[PDB]
């Protein structure tokens with residue numbers, strides 16, 4: 001099973017200038033809980049944005065060019081990325097925009113955080129078709145001293 005996890009600001013913005021400009025510790029904690037002990041697939045730009053391997057996860061990087069760091073696994077195609085994960089119950093695709101586009105048709109589950117923030121951005125989450133997806137979990141949180149925007153954790157499963 002392939003799942004996508006992402007945090008979306010208004011208008012599906014996910015990034016600007018190879019960064020995420022907001023800071024929502026509660027959402028990073030949610031990201032860690034839902035990805036720990038699973039393989040994570042990311043594109044090369046997202047690897048450069050994170051800047052280090054994510055501990056406790058098999059890190060698989062998509063790039064058309066040879067890898068430059070043996071602490072992670074480098075692959076050259078979507079099919080190779082999937083194969084490099086082995087026989088696991090759940091593969092997590094962690095972006096960015098161009099990677100999410102390619103894996104969306106193959107995904108059974110989306111873990112989405114909707115952030116009440118307006119962000120100028122240059123990268124968006126793919127338009128998906130709402131009729132294809134059932135919301136099975138949602139949890140709203142107001143802003144607090146640690147998280148400066150309200151946010152909504154949602155899990156959707158392909159119908």
Ligand SMILES: NC(=O)c1ccc[n+]([C@@H]2O[C@H](COP(=O)([O-])OP(=O)(O)OC[C@H]3O[C@@H](n4cnc5c(N)ncnc54)[C@H](OP(=O)(O)O)[C@@H]3O)[C@@H](O)[C@H]2O)c1
Nearest residue numbers: 006007015018019043044045046063064095096097098099
């Ligand atoms: N809010 C969130 O949830 C979230 C999550 C992740 C990322 N982001 C943001 O998203 C932005 C980065 O997204 P992006 O769309 O620019 O880039 P990306 O999807 O992270 O990376 C694109 C790169 O991945 C490689 N790639 C993708 N598909 C491939 C394929 N089929 N075969 C081989 N290589 C492939 C290519 O690398 P080469 O050029 O080396 O061939 C391509 O240039 C940043 O702003 C980041 O902060 C946000």
Ligand SMILES: Nc1nc(=O)c2nc(CNc3ccc(C(=O)N[C@@H](CCC(=O)O)C(=O)O)cc3)cnc2[nH]1
Nearest residue numbers: 005006007027028029031032050054055094095113
């Ligand atoms: N919901 C969601 N939020 C995100 O921030 C997110 N980020 C990415 C890609 N970028 C990043 C950037 C930083 C870290 C990071 O530092 N993660 C630590 C945080 C642990 C914690 O704060 O509790 C990790 O171990 O996962 C992960 C992914 C992909 N999907 C996402 N999905």
Ligand SMILES: [Mn+2]
Nearest residue numbers: 077078079080
């Ligand atoms: Mn092929």
Ligand SMILES: [Mn+2]
Nearest residue numbers: 083086087088
């Ligand atoms: Mn197999």
Ligand SMILES: [Mn+2]
Nearest residue numbers: 116117149150
């Ligand atoms: Mn806000």
